[PDB]
């Protein structure tokens, strides 16, 4: 490590601190506890296989993450006093909080894929791996322990990764910008700072306001845990490709530059702030360069539009309406693309029905609050950036009359006619407990 360690890394789950591998392979599995006894036995069987964040900066070929819903803790027999100490948003669950998320219309929970939104997801298991061999080793273990456990049911399994050049379902490099955590042991990459106080991401530690956020009780249940918003999206890549072709007239006929303007980065990962006129793939793949900007040199969005995805999600130095503290609205993202590789040349309606997309694991000590805030305030409206009702082009709920403001000299351009290019298929609010908490849960009576 190269910075003072303040976190109990040996007790925090690996996924809280470990970056997604590149390349990456893995599996998401949703599990229901049919009995309390089955859920506890499953956790006991899995605990030796759930790695901590010890030396999270080092190479690790695979790890297995575990996160538990409100209905899963209830079913395990967590006492009512403990259940009551969780946030109300978590207890209600993601679908129940649809109004706070603007999960309406195409994203309404009524239309979600089973098992999401029904209370049946109790445990989400995620295997992350850097190579196929170690992915399969961890998968064999997890499936063996699941099969061996009476009283649990595998609801759904979906494999992810294996994408060409690790690109996501719209062909973008991702996993680039995540918060640095003061006390993790590792100094920020250039532009990744400022390091955020640890309590914003790990319960039991002081946050930006100097005190620990509210946490579950007793201490062995809440300390060194965190919250997760898990969201699965389907990607409509045919409609996205057709949109780029039909609106590239607004970016000199260059469809890849329009792709860069909508997200804020070229698909290579190069941010427009550091590559405003042509792509720079080498820069895009280099973590010591690809995040080293703050928008101070782009107050008007002539490089990165103020309503582009990344500038919405992390405004950095942008002048917003109302002096907002961005440090308390950060989120750790583990993004996992799934399904057939993105095809940049496929623009048919049938291409939209290819089963590809992304899962996100959004991690924070207040993941419910921050996911709701981002969804309601920075994705599905634009008051903070002074562009009215415009919604995020990549994950906002679109209709054809909503616009995307593309700053240009001498006059701005407003594109329109977007679809919702990434549609929510389901999600859950989950608790990612410490290793000590997992042991405690498995030993409830
Ligand atoms: C669902 C489809 C989505 C796609 C295809 C997508 C794609 C991307 C891409 C390409 C990047 C830039 C590379 C990187 O920094 O990793 C990015 C960044 C980011 N996205 Fe998304 N994203 C999606 C949804 C979301 C949602 C729902 C949220 C939060 C509620 C979100 C939050 C962020 C954040 C915080 C960043 C980093 C911004 C920064 O620090 O500069 N994304 N996303
Ligand atoms: Ca359409
Ligand atoms: Cl990551
Ligand atoms: O992403
Ligand atoms: O993202």
Residue numbers in the entry: 16 to 460
What does the paper say about this structure?
Dye-decolorizing peroxidases (DyPs) are heme proteins with distinct structural properties and substrate specificities compared to classical peroxidases. Here, we demonstrate that DyP from the extremely radiation-resistant bacterium Deinococcus radiodurans is, like some other homologues, inactive at physiological pH. Structurally, DyP-type peroxidases also differ from the classical peroxidases. In contrast with the α-helix rich structures of the latter, DyPs are organized in two domains with a ferredoxin-like fold of four anti-parallel β-sheets surrounded by α-helices. A sequence analysis of DrDyP compared to four characterized and structurally determined members of the class V peroxidase family of DyPs, demonstrates that the proximal His heme ligand, and the four residues that are proposed to form the hydrogen peroxide binding pocket within this family of DyPs are conserved in DrDyP (H324, D189, R348, L373 and F375).
